[model samples]
Structure formats: structure tokens, C-alpha cells
Target: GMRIDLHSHTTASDGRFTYQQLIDRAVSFEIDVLAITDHDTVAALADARAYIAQQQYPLQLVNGIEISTVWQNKDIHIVGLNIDPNSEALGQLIARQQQRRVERAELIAHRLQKATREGVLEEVQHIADGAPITRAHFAKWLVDNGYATNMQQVFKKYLTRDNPGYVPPNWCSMSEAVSAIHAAGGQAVLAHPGRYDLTAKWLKRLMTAFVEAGGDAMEVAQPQQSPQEKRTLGDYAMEYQLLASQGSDFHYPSPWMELGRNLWLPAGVEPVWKDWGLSP
Candidate 1:
């Protein structure tokens, strides 16, 4: 059967694989189409496209990026698909996001130093393996330096809500993020709605606002969602007349999740791929 994964990350963000490496892995898995939806940036797509073209792979790569936002005082991730990576409007927005990331990283570093009395920033910079310094980078540093044994432990101990090292950075407003995607000639999709901890009433409110702000789809099928959860999301998509999208939300391959490995939509559930004009 044909495969399509609409959400994934590479070393351009927190993921372990490089752009070329991700494409290679997709080829190995025989995926028909993929999108590199890196956090707050689309810098990797140009290189990924060039590599795919040069290799003459059958894979069809879509231009995608994930914009971080906040709704109900919690982090919300929105994925933009089929974007114009060269759009001036989107580029300016990404420049702003990069600035915010740097400032937030500094604040997180300071908090970690104060909490553990250890220079976590220095270790992170040294151990980041040349990828961007994300909170995950710091978490890995904590694990490597014996402050924590694993990423989950580090988050539970110091990086999560109410933790000493927790700091919520300002993200683009939902309207602004959706506008950026539209300006870039793409569809803004809500990524992993089930992952966002929101009450049913609050979630519907968010979706209403999303539709008002020109959002185009909902990621109904993701790596973490069970069959039942996927069905619930699919019902919501149909109820709202929003397109249905799917992805692995792939980061690094782990026992909990694997690259390009996600449950398919149950037969007869319409998918957004056809709406977006993607075909096997």
C-alpha cells in the first residue's frame, strides 16, 4: 500500500536524523510522500528537496513547517503544509520565531543552572551534536551528566509544568500563524489535537477560532493516537468540515514511536491528502 507521512522532523530541529538522512529513511520505508514539518522553521525543506531531486527518488516531498502557538495557556502546535519556503512573509515570521527561540533557550539555561547548580548550558552546547539547542538538548545533557537517567525523567524532574526550569516562551498568535501559512500559499493544519490537553468545550472553541483564522485541516491520525482516539478526531473533522490529515509526528526512532509508523485511517474515512491533491 502507498504511504504518506505529513509530519516529521530532522536535525534542523530536535530530531536525530539529518535532512538527507530522513529522506534516506523514507526511501528505506518505501513511503510514497512525506512532509518535513520542523518546529517553527522550514529551513530544511530546500535542502531536502534538492537531495530528493538529485537522488531521483520516487518520494514526493511537501513543503511544511510547524508553528508553535498558545491556546488556553498551553502550547499548541500547528502544521503548515505545501508552503512556499521562499515566501517573504513566511520568512519574516520565521526570523521572529528564531529570535524568540534564542531568548527562550537562554532563559531555560539560566533556570537549569539555578536549579541544579550545574552549568547545563555549557554541556548542552558541547553535546548538542550540532543540532539546534532545544529544551530536548538540555534534557539530553541532564541525562548524559547523571542529573537524570532519561528524557522523561529530566522532564518530570525539572522541565515540565511548575518545575523550576519551566519557562513558557511567547509564540505567535494563532491568527498570525495561520496568516503566515496562507501568505506562503499553504494550508494551516492543527497538529495532533488530542495531544493538546484541553477540555472538550475549550477544544471546540479552539477549532472554531482556527476555522475563523483560515486554518484548513486537522491532523486526525498521528503516531500517539489509538484507533478509538483517531475515530473521535475523524468525527470532529467531518463535523467541522475540515480536511483530515495524518502523520507519524516522528522525531527519533524509539520503542514508544517509530519513523513513518502510524495507524492508517479506518477504511471509508476520508483523508486530507486527496483534498491537498496528493496521490500515490
Candidate 2:
């Protein structure tokens, strides 16, 4: 009976829609609850909350943010659900991370300049509209300018590690991300574990350390998981004594990643927000 999507983005980062449009889209999808977990910024939270309050919409909005971190030099994402976006602790981390993004984007743009694509940083900044520029922004620019046909091609050609336009970012650590989310009075969930480029042994090691550092959950019902993969994640959650979570991880208007595409929690596992007294 639950129809909640605990992860998605907005134009505040790399998503195609604005906060309001995101809400409208969620409503159209019959999403009972949604979390706007934009990357490195919660700029859209106030406006979105106000919109929901004033409109008297039945759809429930959860304050969320997705943080970029690096584990073993590989990029990983951590999601904070029901966070106090204005907390001073979280704010400081946000500022530092935002600066990191600025630096990284400039470097990436500088490298891409060698490929005859001048003004990449400028182009992306215009589209970001005060939000932090991300690799997705660069990827979209590549797609829109015919440098690449689509997102997959864009990342494959330019944005990934060792790619032509790529530059390693020295992202926040998993410990810092989990701790900061706790400082913001939020629960941190390990996002899209299946997407990480790691072996099963490596993933288990990562999860052991993540849970020890206060991560509350793992995404057991993540987007595009095979049934076997879902069962494996379910067992991981149970073994770690961590709750199971789900989210669509939506970004642009794509067939695979629409709002409310989340899978139900596997039976016998606890829902991540259950302790928060939230039901969706």
C-alpha cells in the first residue's frame, strides 16, 4: 500500500524540472510521498514546502538531500531523508561541498576546452541557475551540443574517471557524510549500492564500515534491480540490522526513471522511515 519515492532531483542540481514542476509531476504519477534529494544543495526545500503547504496538496514532501562522497577513490552517493536543511552543521558541509563542486566543474570545463568546446563552465553555470554544477550538467551540455547523443554516451565519452573531460574530485568521505546527516537530525541511507563499481566482497566491506559509522539503511529496492539482486540486498539489510529503503532515483524525463517507480520493501525487513513514524 505504500507509494513513496525517497529519492529524486530537481533543477537545483542536474534534474530537468524545477521544484514546482517536480511536485506537479509527482502528483501526476500518484506518488503519495516524495523526497527531493538534490545534489549538494537544499535550495529548493523552502519553496517546495511552501508550495505544498499553501496548495493543500495531499502529497507528502520529505526534506532530503543527496551527498557526493568517495569511497576508495570511487564516487558514491549518500541520501539523507527528513533532514533539517538549515542546520548549521549541514550548512557548513554544504558550503564546502559546493565549493568543491565549483572547483571541480571549472577544472573539468578547462579540460574539455582542449576538445574545442570553449565556455563549458559558462554554459553549465547558466543552466544551473544558482545551483551547484554537476557532471550531469556537463553531460547534458555534451548531449545538447551534439558532442554526445545521450546521457550514457556523454558519460562514456567525457565525464567518467579517466575520460577526456574527467577530473577526480576528492569528494567527501563516507564517515563525514553519515556523521553530517546525523548532525542534521536525519537518517542517512546508502544510495544505489548496486550501481557502485565493486565486487560483492568489496561491497560487504563497505557496508560494514558504513553501518559502523551510523548509516541507518541501504537501498534494497533500488531502481532497475533484478529480482535476485533485490533478494541479495534484502539479505544484506537484514544481516546488517539496517532498514530497507527504496527510491526511484529520478533525474530527467526518462522512461526508466520516473517518479514513483520504487519497489516495495521486501517482506521481513523494516522500512527505513518506520522509526520516524512515517507511513506512505
Candidate 3:
């Protein structure tokens, strides 16, 4: 069976690696199938495909995107797999999402400046390159300049609620994101439910709402999740009758997380890749 990792990012979003570098790493990791689900953009696919072709890499690149949506005032991510990158509707959605991101970045930069923080906006501008600026970029800039020791500290001290750079996100609703993914001929999978900071009851509610909003699947496995937690998510998958998907949700090379690291669908749940025609 092919080793498939369906959710990842690149320099296009908050990921440290560029599209080509990500593909190179995937090939090195022996991942047979890789999906570049950059945040709210399909911009990485064309370049990644070109790299795979030019390098003659034995890697299957899937067209995918991770839509940043808001649900019940909480940030939720939806990963679209096997999508048509050229879909006009998806393009429009991406434009809107990216625009919102830029607006938020501007506001955050302004707030940081007000807090007497310097060089943040320019640093993010440099780090993001042509991609939409995200809080991750801001965190990286702060870390680089010693405002915080690590990404988590940056988020905790500067970017979270009531913090100087915190700006409440005004992203599209989950239903709209799902519709856009469906319009793009993709299956919308809820990304990393365990990481959402929701309690088990709220998580169940989230899965139920996701299913109601035309979500096709939920991630059943990911790198570094506890065995009990995975079992609980598998139970939710069965309860919600959602298809199963798994991804590393990889952002960068790490000793702990790698492409296709410990990805497998839960027992008795249908795999998102089952009908993708990839032979076992």
C-alpha cells in the first residue's frame, strides 16, 4: 500500500519548507502520496507537480487545500483532498480568505506597533514573501527577534486572546468552506479535531456540526496523538458516520513529526483514499 500523507503546508502558508523542498523531503521519507494542503490556497500544487516531474520523483502529489473556517466562534480547519485546483469557485473562496488574512495581519501589526514592538511587520513581510501573512509568520518573526523563546511562547504571550497582537479571526463559516471544497470536487475532511482545545463533549458537537455541514470525513490518525485519544476520535467517527482520513499535518521537519508518520484510518471506518484509485 502507498504511504499517503494528505495534509501539509509549505512556504505558501506557515510551513518552513518551500514547495520543492517539501516534495524533496517527502521523496526522502518514502511517502508515496503527498498532499500540499496549504492554508486556504492551492497555489503550491502546480509548482510541486512541476518539481516532481522535473526531478522524476516517485511521489504522487494530490491537489489539496486547508480552508480556515470559523465554527461557533472557534477556529476550525477543513482539508480538501483530490481537488480541482483550477476551480473558479474555489479560487474565489481562496481570494476572500486570503484577503481576510491580510486584513487581520495588518491589524495585528498595528497592535504590535502600538505595543512598542518594532520590526514585526517588515519581518513578516520578508518571511511571508508573496504568500498571505499569517500569525505563524508573526510568531516566527517574534521568535527570531527574541520577543519570545519559541512559537508557543509567542502565541501565549503575544498572539492569543487579550494579547497585543491578537486579532479575532473573521473567517468564513464551516458550511461555506465545505461547499467550496465540494464545488472543487473534493472531499472535505475536518483537520486535527484533537488539537482544537475543545472538550470531548464539544468535540462531539463539533463532529456533529461538521457532518451536518456536508463534511465528508474526519482525521482519525495523526502523528503524536495518544492512543486513547485516537480511540476516542475513532469512536466519534463511528458515531458521526464520517469517513476516516489521516495526515501528519506536517509543517516542518522534526524529530517527532514526519511525512506519513503513523497515518492509518481507524477500524471499521471507510478511508478517504479508498476510492482514489491508488492501488495497494
Candidate 4:
């Protein structure tokens, strides 16, 4: 079985595993192809590639990035696949994303300080474990400080949308994100569409705009989607004449949803590897 996973994350973003750890796990799982689609970052690929070379893993480690884009008033993720990791245009885009993330993190820290009267800024700085201090880090702080008992509780109480500590980070638009991916000689993919709570009409409009923006694929089969939803997404791919992609969207090691493991696509669905010019 030549497995292909087009989407994944590492500690460079919110994911739990480090870049090398993810590659080690992938090799263990016999994943033939892997992509490190970290949220708004590409700095992890150098180490990941080095690890692959050193270990002599028989796998294709594609350079990938997940860009957060705003469409129809909701945050959507667009995964760029097979990109030149050192491309100047992609570097500029990632720099902008990092800058915006820093600003948004500061605003979030201020809001949490006001709400909790606690020194969250210093606390999160200490607890970030060398990774980017994100809202998830703050949420963990809330749990440690007895403000909340768990990550889910923290999000529900203060970090989710419309919550007091929630600060919407300014992300790249669909057009800009697509342009960046194309400029980097990669394909832009609409990742996990069902996660976005868009109306059918609105989703259609977004897909139309995505196609117009040079988007080339959709995640038609992801671990999170139900069987029916996967079918629907597959239909959407066919309807829009877009390539079908699949991924586990693996962020952590879980028995229910580990890397290279997921709900298998039913027969007859087009797999994304078909578009990679690889023999499937």
C-alpha cells in the first residue's frame, strides 16, 4: 500500500509533534508520502528534510504549508502542496503571517490579562515549550492557573469565537493565498471544507471564487468527515473539475486518528495522488 498524506502539522504551529518526530512516526507507519502543512509556517521543513536524509527514510517529504484564509466571514485553511520551500515569494508571505501572528498573540494576551487579572503574558512565555505562543498555549495557561480545567473548557469559556479573549488574527485573503502558492510553483487546495460552517449557497460561491483564484484541489476525503460528507465533497470535486485530495489532518498521536490512518474513501473516489504525476 503506497500511502499518501497531503496534510499534517508540527509544533511549528499548534500541532503537538515536532518535525522530526512526525517524520519518524510517518516512517514507522510506512507512509510512502508525507507533507508538513504547518499552519502559516515553513521553517520546519529544513529540519524535517535533514532528518529524512539522515535516516534514509524511503518516503517523499513534500514541502507543504497551510495558509489561513478568510472566506464568507469564516476562517478557512488552504494547503499548498509540493512547494519550493526556499521560494522568495513564499518566504515573504510566511513572514507576513508570522508578523500578524505576533501582533494577534499580544492582543490576546492583553485581553486575557484584563479578564483574569493574571500575568498571562509572562506565564505563556514561560510555558510555550519553545514553540510559538498561540491561543492554545494561553488556553493551557488558563487550565494551569485554575481558570479552566481543560483545553476544551478554556476554549468554551474564553478563547472561542465571540469569547472575550478571542482576537481574530488578520489572515491572507483567498486570492492572496492562492497567488502565493502559485507563485511558489505549488498547487493550492481547499482543506477540510466541511469544517467551515458555510451555507450551501455561500460554500458554492466560495468554491467559485477559489477556482477563480487558481485553486486546484479540494480535500475530498479527510479523517474528520463522515462517509456521506466525503461523498458530497467528492461530488463537489467532480462538479467543479478539481482534483480530489485526502489527508488525516493529523495533529497528535491518537488511537482513533493517527497519522496515515483514517476513514478509507469508498471505491470510485479520485485520490489526490493522481494529480501529483505519480504512479498510483
Clashing pairs in 4: none
The root-mean-square deviation over C-alpha atoms between each candidate and the true structure, in angstroms, is 1.9, 1.5, 1.5, 2.3
Q: Write the per-residue lDDT of candidate 3 for residues 1-280, one digit (tens) a residue.
A: 7888998899888898999888889988889989899987888898889889999988988899999899988889999998999999999999999999888888899898877566677778999998888788888888888889987688778977878888876899999999999999999999999878888789889998999999999998999887777777888888898888889978887788899988876567778887888852
lDDT of 1 by residue, 1-280 (tens): 5698999999788787889988999899888889999887887999899999999998999999988887656778889999999999999998888788777877888988897866777777676554456777888777877888887788778777888779885888888999999999998999889866678998899888888888889988877667888888888888887888889877788787765677588655567677556567
Per-prediction backbone clash count = 0, 0, 0, 0
| Candidate 4 lDDT tens digits, 3-47 | 888888888877778888889899888888898998888879888
1 versus 4: better TM-score goes to: 1
Number of the predicted model whose lDDT against the real structure is largest: 3
Off by over 4 Å in 2: none
lDDT, candidate 2, equals 0.87
Off by over 4 Å in 4: 127-133, 143-154, 266-268
Q: If scored against the real structure, what TM-score would every candidate get? A: 0.93, 0.95, 0.95, 0.90
Scored against the true structure, residue 63 in model 2 reaches a CA lDDT of 93
Arranged by lDDT with the best first, the candidates are: 3, 2, 1, 4
lDDT of 1 at 54: 98
Model 1 CA lDDT for position 261 = 78
